Design a binder for this molecule. Structure first.
Ligand code: GLA
Length: 350
């Protein structure tokens, strides 16, 4: 029997940049999918979240339109990439909330991959783990996504965020400040409802790159955007400013300038809300109130349209701010909102 712990993730800055090969800055967080498993002739897994066992023969990588598809996708990508692995039997648990925008998909996928890597001695390198997991999600599960989530879950390091160039896959660890907490606020609005909106943004951005004759948004300046159609131009304008914001956060973090990091996150949030049109009133409520209550800055994290937001707050104030906002929020909105205090953590391992 082996036990794997696979973290979720939060993106600090660099939202909706990964599918145009821009800059991102995620961290693994200390909320986890846990998998305890051993070799078996078929695949049998009990999910504590769902309170159920699902199984399949290794022969049977047909989509079933249930959570077991994330497991089949890993077996599929390994087979398609010329690895021979056997079955597993075990239990999936942990404290990472599902469908909250903290990447339980990448957490789970990478956790299963790591379980197979260890049981079957595959000796996968970290980058391979990221690419295989991404490929499973894109091509088997059928969720468009960029590399952000998988990269964080694998490459996370305790006390650090990851500065990543998604075009080249060059990356750098940057220390996160002492006694500054990341307050995570889940709106209780499941973001999966607007997955068509994500696909629309991704498709417009890709089309925009082709119009501009460029391979990455890094190569694009605000002046060239006149060449794009008005809707393409509005959205791409956000992307260009966001790439620049990532580089500024990088410089500010390396100086320990938390106040400036916070200011940039807040600017980014409003740019997302007003120009990229991917926020919602629940998210904006959290951001505005977090700022009034003394956060250095706040921003939605992940795709938007629900899910979670983050606020950078003094460690000794994080619980109080989270509690005060949650209480106000529940009077205003009917959803099962939750708050978590998280810290930058190590990536997947045993
Ligand atoms: O930054 C937006 C973010 O949206 C989702 O979380 C995707 O899975 C990521 O790859 C990224 O595109």
């Amino acid at each position: 029997m082996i036990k794997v712990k696979s973290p979720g993730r939060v993106n600090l800055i660099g939202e909706h940049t990964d599918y145009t090969y821009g800059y991102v800055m995620p961290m693994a967080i200390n909320l986890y999918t846990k998998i305890e498993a051993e070799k078996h002739g078929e695949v049998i897994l009990y999910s504590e979240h769902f309170g159920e066992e699902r199984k399949f023969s290794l022969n049977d990588l047909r989509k079933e339109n249930s959570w077991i598809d994330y497991v089949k996708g890993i077996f599929w990508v390994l087979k398609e990439s010329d690895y021979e692995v056997g079955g597993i039997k075990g239990r999936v648990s942990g404290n990472l909330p599902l469908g909250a925008g903290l990447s339980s998909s990448a957490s789970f996928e990478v956790g299963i991959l790591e379980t197979l890597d260890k049981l079957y001695n595959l000796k996968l390198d970290s980058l391979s783990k990221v690419l295989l997991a991404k490929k499973a999600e894109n091509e088997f599960v059928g969720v468009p996504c960029g590399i952000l989530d998988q990269f964080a879950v694998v490459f996370g390091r305790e006390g650090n965020v990851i500065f990543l160039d998604t075009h080249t896959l060059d990356y750098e660890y940057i220390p996160f400040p002492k006694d500054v907490s990341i307050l995570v606020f889940y709106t209780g609005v499941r973001r999966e409802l607007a997955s068509s909106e994500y696909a629309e943004r991704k498709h417009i951005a890709e089309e925009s790159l082709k119009i501009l004759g460029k391979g990455s948004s890094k190569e694009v300046r605000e002046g060239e955007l006149s060449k794009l159609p008005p809707l393409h131009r509005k959205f791409f304008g956000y992307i260009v400013r966001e790439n620049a914001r990532v580089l500024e956060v990088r410089d500010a973090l390396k100086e320990g300038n938390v106040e400036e990091v916070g200011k940039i996150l807040t600017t980014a949030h409003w740019d997302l809300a007003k120009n990229y049109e991917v926020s919602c009133k629940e998210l904006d409520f959290f951001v505005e109130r977090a700022l009034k209550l003394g956060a250095y800055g706040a921003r939605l994290t992940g795709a938007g349209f629900g899910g979670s937001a983050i606020a950078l707050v003094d460690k000794e104030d994080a619980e109080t701010i989270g509690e005060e906002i949650l209480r106000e929020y529940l009077k205003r909105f009917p959803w099962k909102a939750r708050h978590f205090i998280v810290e930058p953590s190590d990536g997947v391992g045993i």
